Design a protein around this ligand. Structure first.
Ligand SMILES: Nc1ncnc2c1ncn2[C@@H]1O[C@H](COP(=O)(O)OP(=O)(O)OP(O)(O)=S)[C@@H](O)[C@H]1O
Lengths: 50, 375
């Protein structure tokens, strides 16, 4: 009775970053830091699972 | 050269409108200045009449008093229990007064909004007719129930799975009889204090006793109902006393008349058997999930004022619809409109209905245990 259909209407789950959004989030938070850009973030997103 | 009449009338009409409005302002302030000096009075209730001159009253704010009338207070009016007025200093009785209203009642008396009648709901034509037969007929024509010589049922209990429109059926009654629906939400009653809730229950039962065709409606009972405890949290004591208020004065010795109580719950398994017996609540009235024709009925009720085209296999949508609610298929039509505004179609295509059905399928893979039959 807290939900039922439309006590709250749109039931929206949140996924975890699959692979690509990990490098995206790393890019987002590393935007402020000064980087010597010898970094493939896709390596890091491809190794850090879940 | 005879324009002096226009000038004299101009100045005189300016001064006359000015005098009218300004003396009207001065007259408003004159009446409001005359009314300044008066002094208010004390609200009290009459316990009993002691002698011809002596009157025992207890105001709500504290102690008890013995005073008398002025000259012309017409002492036969003072029945024991009437609400009267008292002087602040001299403290004698001034004027017999009509009874209190306690505007907590008013915020659940006047605040019925508009609604559409019982043709809006559907697929549950047993309960509609049955509630009509158990309520409207013993208040319109009691002699059908007196020629038989059998006491009419008093209390009705709506129950079932959540979202079957248990609220909107009573709301349709609140758009059918339109008489005195005291729709108590039954959660905003308790505030903090000691016996305030008991006094509010007394107030509601007096008010329902007086305005002879009253409809008592208490939604979401289980908060204030409970069952019983082995004496755990202390506030539960006053909870149970607040419930035993209802348990007494719904039955008492002075039987209620035309006091029809409409009740709705989310799970009726947790009620007190003190409340579960007949007499207080006569007939358990069960609502369940719509069937195929019933899902068809609610779907075509919601699909009325929706801009679309003549393509709608309602049988397909109801076929994928499986064990749903009043609001499930409402959510189907709502999300059908959502998917219509998705990609900006300005009509509702039939595939949007299937997308919304699969959205409902995503929704109700997180909900279960929808069968609470009491007792
Ligand atoms: N069978 C139905 N036909 C039409 N509209 C319905 C139907 N069932 C529900 N509705 C609508 O959906 C709403 C659901 O009302 P509810 O608040 O669920 O009643 P309820 O007793 O409060 O149910 P719960 O247990 O609190 S979720 C109603 O107000 C109607 O607008």
């Amino acid at each position: 009775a807290l939900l039922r259909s439309g006590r709250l209407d749109r039931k929206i789950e949140f996924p975890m970053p699959n692979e690509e959004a990990r490098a995206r989030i790393m890019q987002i938070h590393s935007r402020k830091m000064n980087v010597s850009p010898d970094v493939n973030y896709e390596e890091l997103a491809r190794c850090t699972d879940d | 050269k005879l324009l002096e009449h226009k000038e004299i009338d101009g100045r005189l009409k300016e001064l006359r409108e000015q005098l009218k409005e300004l003396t009207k302002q001065y007259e408003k302030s004159e009446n409001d200045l005359k009314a300044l000096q008066s002094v208010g009075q004390i609200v009290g209730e009459v316990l009993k009449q002691l002698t011809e001159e002596k009157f025992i009253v207890k105001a709500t704010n504290g102690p008890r008093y013995v005073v008398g009338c002025r000259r012309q207070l017409d002492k036969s009016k003072l029945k024991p229990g009437t609400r009267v007025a008292l002087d602040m200093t001299t403290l004698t009785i001034m004027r017999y007064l009509p009874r209190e209203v306690d505007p907590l009642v008013y915020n659940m008396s006047h605040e019925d909004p508009g609604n559409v009648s019982y043709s809006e709901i559907g697929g549950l034509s047993e309960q509609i007719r049955e509630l009509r037969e158990v309520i409207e007929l013993p208040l319109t024509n009691p002699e059908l129930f007196q020629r038989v010589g059998i006491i009419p049922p008093k209390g009705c209990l709506l129950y079932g799975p959540p979202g079957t429109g248990k609220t909107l059926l009573a709301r349709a009654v609140a758009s059918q009889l339109d008489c005195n629906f005291l729709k108590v939400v039954s959660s905003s009653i308790v505030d903090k204090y000691i016996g305030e809730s008991a006094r509010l229950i007394r107030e509601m039962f007096n008010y329902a006793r007086d305005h002879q065709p009253c409809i008592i409606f208490m939604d979401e009972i289980d908060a204030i109902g409970g069952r019983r405890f082995s004496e755990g949290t202390s506030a539960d004591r006053e909870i149970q006393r607040t419930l035993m208020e209802l348990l007494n004065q719904m039955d008492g010795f002075d039987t209620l008349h035309r006091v029809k109580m409409i009740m709705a719950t989310n799970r009726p398994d947790t009620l007190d058997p003190a409340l579960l017996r007949p007499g207080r609540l006569d007939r358990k009235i069960h609502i369940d999930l719509p069937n195929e024709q019933a899902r068809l009925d609610i779907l075509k009720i919601h699909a009325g004022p929706i801009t679309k085209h003549g393509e709608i296999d309602y049988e397909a949508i109801v076929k994928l619809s499986d064990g749903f609610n009043g609001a499930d298929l409402r959510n189907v039509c709502t999300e059908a409109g959502m998917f219509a505004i998705r990609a900006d179609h300005d009509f509702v295509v039939q595939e949007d209905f299937m997308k919304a059905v699969r959205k409902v399928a995503d929704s109700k893979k997180l909900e279960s245990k929808l069968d609470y039959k009491p007792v």
